[PDB]
Design a protein around this ligand. Sequence first.
Ligand SMILES: CO[C@@H]1O[C@@H](C)[C@@H](O)[C@@H](O)[C@@H]1O
Ligand SMILES: CO[C@@H]1O[C@@H](C)[C@@H](O)[C@@H](O)[C@@H]1O
Ligand SMILES: CO[C@@H]1O[C@@H](C)[C@@H](O)[C@@H](O)[C@@H]1O
Ligand SMILES: CO[C@@H]1O[C@@H](C)[C@@H](O)[C@@H](O)[C@@H]1O
Ligand SMILES: [Ca+2]
Ligand SMILES: [Ca+2]
Ligand SMILES: [Ca+2]
Ligand SMILES: [Ca+2]
Ligand SMILES: [Ca+2]
Ligand SMILES: [Ca+2]
Ligand SMILES: [Ca+2]
Ligand SMILES: [Ca+2]
Lengths: 113, 113, 113, 113
Amino acid sequence: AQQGVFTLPARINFGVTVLVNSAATQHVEIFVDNEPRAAFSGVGTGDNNLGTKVINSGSGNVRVQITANGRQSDLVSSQLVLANKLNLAVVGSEDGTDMDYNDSIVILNWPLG
Amino acid sequence: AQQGVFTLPARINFGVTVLVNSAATQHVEIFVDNEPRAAFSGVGTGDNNLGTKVINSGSGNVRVQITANGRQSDLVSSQLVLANKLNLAVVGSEDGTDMDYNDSIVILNWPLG
Amino acid sequence: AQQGVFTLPARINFGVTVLVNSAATQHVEIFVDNEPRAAFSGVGTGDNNLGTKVINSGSGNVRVQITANGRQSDLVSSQLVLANKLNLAVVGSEDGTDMDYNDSIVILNWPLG
Amino acid sequence: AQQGVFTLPARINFGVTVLVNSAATQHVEIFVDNEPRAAFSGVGTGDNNLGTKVINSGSGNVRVQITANGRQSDLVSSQLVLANKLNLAVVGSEDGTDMDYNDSIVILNWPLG
Ligand SMILES: CO[C@@H]1O[C@@H](C)[C@@H](O)[C@@H](O)[C@@H]1O
Ligand SMILES: CO[C@@H]1O[C@@H](C)[C@@H](O)[C@@H](O)[C@@H]1O
Ligand SMILES: CO[C@@H]1O[C@@H](C)[C@@H](O)[C@@H](O)[C@@H]1O
Ligand SMILES: CO[C@@H]1O[C@@H](C)[C@@H](O)[C@@H](O)[C@@H]1O
Ligand SMILES: [Ca+2]
Ligand SMILES: [Ca+2]
Ligand SMILES: [Ca+2]
Ligand SMILES: [Ca+2]
Ligand SMILES: [Ca+2]
Ligand SMILES: [Ca+2]
Ligand SMILES: [Ca+2]
Ligand SMILES: [Ca+2]
């Protein structure tokens, strides 16, 4: 199945947070309606927090892509809703051979404020 | 049900990341085996990222506590496992009256590295 | 936080499946727009499957209530989305003192077909 | 990533429940330690419930396999823990071209009783 693809409410601001756990430099790109709208990069094995960016969901079509070593990482993803209100969309990714799926972890959340 | 309490693998390092979305200053404490092991605080309505701290799970008994305006916030939580490997334990919290449950969002993840 | 309350897409058919793990007889009621629309009852400690019923979500406001021993059970719930398409809304419940939260398990899923 | 594979607590009884939503006859096999331990089959587009079977997790290595039209369906999966106690492992599957991932839905839950 496709992974890292989420339908958000239209025209909503959402946060994107990235954590890294790899020796390979990670490159995360967030697409909204197929347009490149947020980028992160970093490296480190101690859950290195690359910060949070807030962007708008456009029509709602959001996609996460992660690269390392010049190639697309393998993705795994899910969406969770807590208290019928708090949404988290989570992506884990694997750049190598150990199947730890923590090399980049991308968290989308909404609503904000 | 109790919320914000998780059983982790014993003696594992895990990351804790906090985002805030409230006018009230948030105070997060992470307990391991009933002892305080990590603190965060901050205020903001823009999904403001308080950083990540790595701590050890001890026997595995981890509890997230969130306080604002001198009162423990109402918590909601769950744990997700992706690819049979990546664990996220998520806590939303409500400090007020709007039931948005985003006032502090606390994310635990393991394994690291 | 309120638990067992979910916002579904409007006017959608969804399935409700109930499993029981208790010596106390369980009574599950599904409300749609505050109206009583599906009922299940049963007992047993071996994950006894009470079947699946398909009902319509109306405006989208769905609530799960569970009783045993004449009183409302304590609920815990979450919603999961897989492949950006398959929705499960899950309720666990506790009728007693052992905090196993399996006494009735209610699963809502959509879309069908 | 591999999907439909879960590590359960060792030697635990768990329930497996299957729902179908397809014109194609579904065949579900649950493997424990690489050995077949439970089968289900059926066909229907109405979230049709194939029942629940209880089996033992052995060493803990559980795999869900879903076949339709003689081909293994594409799987998506995750595990959820509620109240730090109730575990659900969920598998959606796609036998065709519409990407609805509901063709068989397999739900594992533990602990029982
Ligand atoms: C070389 O492998 C990459 O870096 C290592 C330090 C590990 O984080 C591993 O999971 C990752 O895939
Ligand atoms: C006063 O209420 C608090 O601050 C507001 C700006 C909102 O973030 C609200 O959710 C929060 O509970
Ligand atoms: C009397 O307690 C009820 O029945 C027992 C057999 C257990 O299933 C328990 O979890 C449940 O709360
Ligand atoms: C032929 O396609 C199969 O049957 C249809 C009735 C739908 O349930 C579809 O999702 C499924 O893949
Ligand atoms: Ca890796
Ligand atoms: Ca790694
Ligand atoms: Ca609030
Ligand atoms: Ca808020
Ligand atoms: Ca109980
Ligand atoms: Ca029970
Ligand atoms: Ca299909
Ligand atoms: Ca289908």
